[PDB]
Amino acid sequence: MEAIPVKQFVKHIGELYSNNQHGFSEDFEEVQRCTADMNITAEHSNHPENKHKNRYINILAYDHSRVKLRPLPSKHSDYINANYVDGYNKAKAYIATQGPLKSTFEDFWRMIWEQNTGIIVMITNLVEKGRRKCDQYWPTENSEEYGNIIVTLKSTKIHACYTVRRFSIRNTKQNERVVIQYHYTQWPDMGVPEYALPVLTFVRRSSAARMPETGPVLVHCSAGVGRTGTYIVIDSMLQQIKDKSTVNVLGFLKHIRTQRNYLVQTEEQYIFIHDALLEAILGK
Numbered sequence: 001m002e003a004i005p006v007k008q009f010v011k012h013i014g015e016l017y018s019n020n021q022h023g024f025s026e027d028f029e030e031v032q033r034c035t036a037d038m039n040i041t042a043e044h045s046n047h048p049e050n051k052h053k054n055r056y057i058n059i060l061a062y063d064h065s066r067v068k069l070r071p072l073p074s075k076h077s078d079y080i081n082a083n084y085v086d087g088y089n090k091a092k093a094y095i096a097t098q099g100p101l102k103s104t105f106e107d108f109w110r111m112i113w114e115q116n117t118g119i120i121v122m123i124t125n126l127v128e129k130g131r132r133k134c135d136q137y138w139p140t141e142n143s144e145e146y147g148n149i150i151v152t153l154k155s156t157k158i159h160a161c162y163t164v165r166r167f168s169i170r171n172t173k174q175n176e177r178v179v180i181q182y183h184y185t186q187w188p189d190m191g192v193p194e195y196a197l198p199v200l201t202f203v204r205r206s207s208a209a210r211m212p213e214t215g216p217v218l219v220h221c222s223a224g225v226g227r228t229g230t231y232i233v234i235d236s237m238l239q240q241i242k243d244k245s246t247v248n249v250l251g252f253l254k255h256i257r258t259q260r261n262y263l264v265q266t267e268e269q270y271i272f273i274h275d276a277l278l279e280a281i282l283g284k
């Protein structure tokens with residue numbers, strides 16, 4: 001698993017695709033197996049106090065990488081279902097977390113403050129195909145207050161495929177910060193995504209909005225593993241292309257898989273990653 005030179009990567013996509021995507025299948029099987037001889041603890045996620053704080057029972061936050069809330073004047077007020085994840089040539093470039101529940105909106109915005117996050121990437125619709133994916137954690141208009149964080153909507157731009165919301169937030173404790181949410185909104189009534197270019201532009205633009213010397217980028221979908229992982233791998237790999245002109249999708253995914261369970265949750269997503277990077281390379 002050395003990196004693949006960028007000039008041969010589309011060639012390599014051809015081979016993975018061939019014979020009914022046999023190659024993609026071997027690769028993703030390898031990914032799902034690369035936890036085999038690996039026990040990773042998530043005791044906090046499984047604790048009775050913390051259970052109502054998880055959206056899905058089997059989607060947990062690994063202890064070692066979990067984001068810790070500063071505790072409040074109770075022994076578990078430090079928990080949120082969220083993990084730090086690496087970007088390219090950087091550690092904890094991301095926080096990958098579940099879409100926040102009613103009962104965890106306070107924790108969610110607290111984490112945002114404590115971690116000094118300045119960019120949100122939302123990769124779900126609140127509802128999709130009739131099933132609830134995420135409860136709305138920001139104000140429809142003007143201000144809303146969550147715990148000691150007051151969130152104010154300042155600005156919105158709605159594009160074909162995603163929406164950009166510029167919030168201003170303040171800690172009641174005077175000190176204020178700009179936080180921008182990139183929301184990918186375009187979701188099929190049936191099936192799943194199928195052209196990667198719109199996602200590639202969403203990623204390029206959201207990744208570019210990151211400010212130097214800020215905290216990690218928050219990335220969530222519903223469960224916070226599938227599309228969250230897809231974003232992360234595609235972003236990291238454009239970075240790597242830009243810097244070294246090489247690609248290592250398989251190596252990097254194996255790695256961040258130790259940092260949060262089930263990142264990139266399906267083969268179709270694993271294929272989509274390649275399609276995005278293909279668009280980015282042919283596009284140049």
Ligand SMILES: CS(=O)(=O)NC(=O)c1sccc1SCc1ccc(Cl)c(Cl)c1
Pocket residue numbers: 123184192193194199202203226227230231232234265266268269272
């Ligand atoms: C698990 S699933 O919902 O059944 N299938 C998918 O989500 C699947 S299956 C192929 C892609 C996807 S989601 C693609 C995507 C859309 C928007 C963004 Cl911003 C990013 Cl990063 C990635």
